[PDB]
């Protein structure tokens, strides 16, 4: 299992590099600085914490060390605070694109930079409060024993309720906001295609510019991909917890399965900048410029 270490560190570094580049890009290219991209930066920094914090946290939890239950709940459940901060941003962004494309005229004055700060703040407030509830007294602990005397060993299915983990953080905090984003995009993709087909059946441009719609929509499709990947990285872990939780009777998920899902989830913080490079000219060009200068 020394390999589960090498891949985690390989992912640790990867995630910090790529995501700092996203933030370096936006700081740098003037065109990149906009509301839609603050939610992307909130998204990148929430992926930098993972490389800096939650992996060292997650590789350390693999030992099963000893520590005070209430300080211990902090080191297992910090990832919850991030994964959840991710989600409010993706959903923020989606709404943004939805408003921008579906209600183009009211947008400029509706969405503003300082209204964007409000969200990002509140979403960080509610990500800690939601992520750390097990600290709020939802602890499963006090009621391998060598540990004793104030120290109780730190494991996930012991101290952290599979109760709150299946119902509250999956059903309520993820499945719901995800099914919400699937809707909001599909609403854009399906609304946009009618607007595009209704410019066809009619002569002359206007009110909207056709070429400039399908250009907005290609970037929306590109922001939705990210959403889909999240589901693909964070779903199995829950699919697996379902099979483990709904049966605190039936058998438990094996070894080479679980760590594979923890990795697979932590993978979520790497691919993002990579999608931007492939799918978005403006980041790809800033990445390129940055890399061929500051790294040259």
């Amino acid at each position: 299992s020394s390999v589960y270490i090498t891949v985690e560190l390989a992912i640790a570094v990867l995630a910090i590099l790529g995501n700092v580049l996203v933030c370096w890009a936006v700081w740098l290219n003037s065109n990149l600085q906009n509301v839609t991209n603050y939610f992307v930066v909130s998204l990148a920094a929430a992926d930098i914490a993972v490389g800096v914090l939650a992996i060292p946290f997650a590789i350390t939890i693999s030992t099963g060390f000893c520590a005070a239950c209430h300080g211990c709940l902090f080191i297992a459940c910090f990832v919850l605070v991030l994964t959840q901060s991710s989600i409010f941003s993706l959903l923020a962004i989606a709404i943004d694109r939805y408003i921008a494309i579906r209600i183009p005229l009211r947008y400029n004055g509706l969405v503003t930079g300082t209204r964007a700060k409000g969200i990002i703040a509140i979403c960080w407030v509610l990500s800690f409060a939601i992520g750390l509830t097990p600290m709020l007294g939802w602890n499963n602990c006090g009621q391998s024993q060598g540990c004793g005397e104030g120290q109780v060993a730190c494991l996930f299915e012991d101290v952290v309720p599979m109760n709150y983990m299946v119902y509250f953080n999956f059903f309520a905090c993820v499945l719901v906001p995800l099914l919400l984003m699937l809707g909001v995009y599909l609403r854009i993709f399906l609304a946009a295609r009618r607007q595009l087909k209704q410019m066809e059946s009619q002569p002359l441009p206007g009110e909207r510019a056709r070429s400039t719609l399908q250009k907005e929509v290609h970037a929306a499709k590109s922001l939705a991909i990210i959403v889909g990947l999240f589901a693909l990285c964070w779903l199995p872990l829950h699919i697996i917890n379902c099979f483990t939780f709904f049966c605190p009777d039936c058998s438990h998920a094996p070894l080479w399965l679980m760590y594979l899902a923890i990795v697979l989830s932590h993978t979520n913080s790497v691919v993002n900048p990579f999608i931007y490079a492939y799918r978005i000219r403006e980041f790809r060009q800033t990445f390129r410029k940055i890399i061929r200068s500051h790294v040259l």
Partner: antibody
Amino acid sequence: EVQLQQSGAELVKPGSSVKISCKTSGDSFTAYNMNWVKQSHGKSLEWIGNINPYYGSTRYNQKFKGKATLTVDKSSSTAYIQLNSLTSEDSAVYYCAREGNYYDGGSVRYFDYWGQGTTLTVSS
Amino acid sequence: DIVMTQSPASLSASVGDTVTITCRASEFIYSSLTWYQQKQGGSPQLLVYAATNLADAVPSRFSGSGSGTQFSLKINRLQPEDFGTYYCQHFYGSTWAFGGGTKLEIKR
């Protein structure tokens, strides 16, 4: 249909002021930044500045700060440009252009629609 | 600030031959370069935006290309309607600036 309809030619004595108007019909006026450009001797183009029609907020090209001041009227849905302390060097054609915006991941901007131009001649 | 400069300042061409005009920004603007076509006594019209993208109902024969500091508009197989002077504009940054234009004239 979208038209930007500019006020007509102006003939002025140096040292005076002028308000050139741009009326926009055929869309929502408050959704887009209005910009003004100046064309001198039917060749070179300069960006004068622009204005957010919703809040009346303006950015100016530095060269034009203090000679040009931009203002709007939402009701009649028209944008203005006023020129002060006019001299011959200000004789040109001033256009209004409507800026346009979308997210490519970057903020894409262009001048969608332009007015017909209005001719300002300063002489003594 | 960011100085835009294009070439050539005048170009004369026969109908049907292909033409490229170039535009060079004094700083790195990525895309954020646009192109305008102005016919004599007319107001400029939008040609290419994002430096690669054609405007609604602009003939496919026009194409933009380039990025960073170097851009070019190329008209394939020129048409009589294409003669006129062409301008580029950068939207990079807060303050914006045009080209000198290039004047496309008929060879005879």
